[PDB]
Design an enzyme around this catalytic site. Structure first.
Site, PDB file in Angstrom:
ATOM      1  CE  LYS B  60      37.740  -3.323  39.116  1.00 28.34           C
ATOM      2  NZ  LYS B  60      36.262  -3.433  39.151  1.00 28.34           N
ATOM      3  CB  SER B 313      30.972  -6.314  35.223  1.00 33.81           C
ATOM      4  OG  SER B 313      30.047  -5.642  36.055  1.00 33.81           O
TER       5      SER B 313
END
Ligand code: NA
Lengths: 320, 327
Positions: B60, B313
């Protein structure tokens, strides 16, 4: 002059082809920032069985003749070498026996059994298992598989050096943990044969560092006071072949404290999301210790994460 | 396909290339090794993309940094604002520190203490408020109106999507002959970015999404043909606990994502265990979704004798939770 050469490593690469695969070597954000240079982590903790030791064991075992393989094989280890030999035995259809002390870490025993080899629990210490191995060799004629002091084992380990230079042409330093010296000997031969400008530097624990003592002394010497978090490198006296190679090719060997090993383990798990055992954190411990600053600043350095065979309970214990 | 995307979708390859330029020398490429365990289990070559090892512990940072760096100097001076109980908070906070931007991050009361701590340690002001996401959105709305700060969306923003898409470029750099890329979905920013990058360079590559059975707004929307809400309950894959997808992301996903599969909580757990014990990496639940799909058998027709990348992720999970799952 050396008992292992680049050709032995290229032979190992051929034997391992399609069986043992290259591990990752990414740049580390945390270590690069801390060290003020580019730090790359070689993930031998993600090699089959959770350490690099499958490489040397598989090369040795595969290099046996059909008649030698039929004799069966024997080893003694309560950890990473046991697992490497066991899986190699399964992969090659070789009959294996692995000796351990009477009551050794249960995670490592079932892992060794699951990998195929017969586990023999015997003795209250490593001396007693060697003795039992000696009996098994004499009575059964099984071939002993050394954990480091063997040219095929060294050659297998050296395949790591080839991978490093395949992935990073302009590497400046390779930092390597040492127990008996197979890993660093192999890597040193591979690296120095292809590009001898690259520095190869070893790391051991303050508490126990036979290889380092030997390196400083100029002959094979024993050193041990007590054990270490870097248990995979708890080796009081180096191999004959490995010391010969290290004496000639290794640029330096540094020592790190138990606290430095702990700090490195914490950084690797917390700041790099990488599970390492104590021996797998040694090279990074040297990086964080400051003892390598002159080598690593504004340069490219590879640190070997040699193994990850540690229970999360133990990781939690060490992190605190 | 590159031209079709450029003309007909709200984000395109050019945006990803711009993002690459903004991130150069600041955000670095993560590892993507072959996995012994997953390759053995799946009867094909499985590679793991380690966004768990990206700055802040998830991908992110990419989208946040691209968005914030893309702001004009005048925009930066307004300050920025975000809401998140975790990965997005950390991404925005670090980006603010790296760019010298004034940031305010609204987190729910009772967000994990390590996550709140992590967000404070970077730079941004942390505002603790409310017992849910909607409450933090409400406080963000107040802050925007009263202070004039620029809101940083967690997925539904062209710059955020483009930043995420830099992962796609790295995949193609490291493995030009990849066959499949498996990607977790929450709001759809990650997969939208990756899909654009991958399909613009080689449209023959399959891009497949994964969500939890327990909550899968994007999947529901994909299967129905309109934006639709879905949430049964929470999930181990908390980073993908998103009940309704983004507008931009849905548009991109419906055009470029080949399929979306669902995995159970047990499947997520099993995948976490495999990654930790057999691959020696710390993954959070959302980080294990793609690998869960692979182990589930639900991707078996795509993966044998092929090269497949699985996105890890994120790794933002407390060691105690990992130690509990393993132990
Ligand atoms: Na489809």
């Amino acid at each position: 002059d050396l008992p292992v050469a680049i050709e032995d490593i290229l032979e190992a690469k051929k034997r391992l082809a399609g069986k043992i695969y290259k591990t990752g070597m990414p740049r580390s954000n945390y270590f690069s920032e801390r060290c003020k240079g580019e730090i790359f982590l070689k993930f031998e903790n993600m090699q089959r069985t959770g350490s690099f030791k499958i490489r040397g064991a598989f090369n040795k075992l595969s290099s046996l003749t059909e008649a030698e393989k039929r004799k069966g094989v024997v080893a003694c280890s309560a950890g990473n070498h046991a697992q490497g030999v066991s899986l190699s035995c399964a992969m090659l259809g070789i009959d294996g026996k692995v000796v351990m002390p009477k009551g050794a870490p249960k995670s490592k025993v079932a892992a060794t059994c699951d990998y195929s080899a017969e586990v023999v629990l015997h003795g209250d210490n490593f001396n007693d298992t060697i003795a039992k191995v000696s009996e098994i060799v004499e009575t059964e004629g099984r071939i002993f598989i050394p954990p480091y002091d063997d040219p095929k084992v060294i050659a297998g380990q050296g395949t790591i050096g080839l991978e490093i230079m395949e992935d990073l042409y302009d590497v400046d330093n390779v930092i390597v943990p040492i127990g008996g010296g197979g890993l660093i000997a192999g890597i040193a031969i591979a690296i120095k044969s292809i590009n001898p400008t690259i520095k190869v530097i070893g790391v051991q624990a303050e508490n126990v560092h036979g290889m380092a003592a030997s390196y400083y002394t100029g002959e094979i010497t024993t050193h041990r006071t007590t054990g270490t978090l870097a248990d995979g490198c708890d080796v009081s006296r180096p191999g004959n072949l490995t010391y010969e190679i290290v004496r000639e090719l290794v640029d330096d060997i540094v020592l790190v404290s138990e606290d430095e090993i702990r700090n490195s383990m914490i950084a690797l798990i917390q700041r790099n999301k990488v599970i390492t055992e104590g021996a797998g954190a040694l090279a990074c411990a040297a990086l964080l210790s400051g003892k390598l600053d002159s080598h690593i600043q504004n340069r490219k350095t590879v640190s070997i994460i040699s193994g990850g065979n540690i229970d999360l309970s133990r990781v939690s214990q060490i992190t605190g």
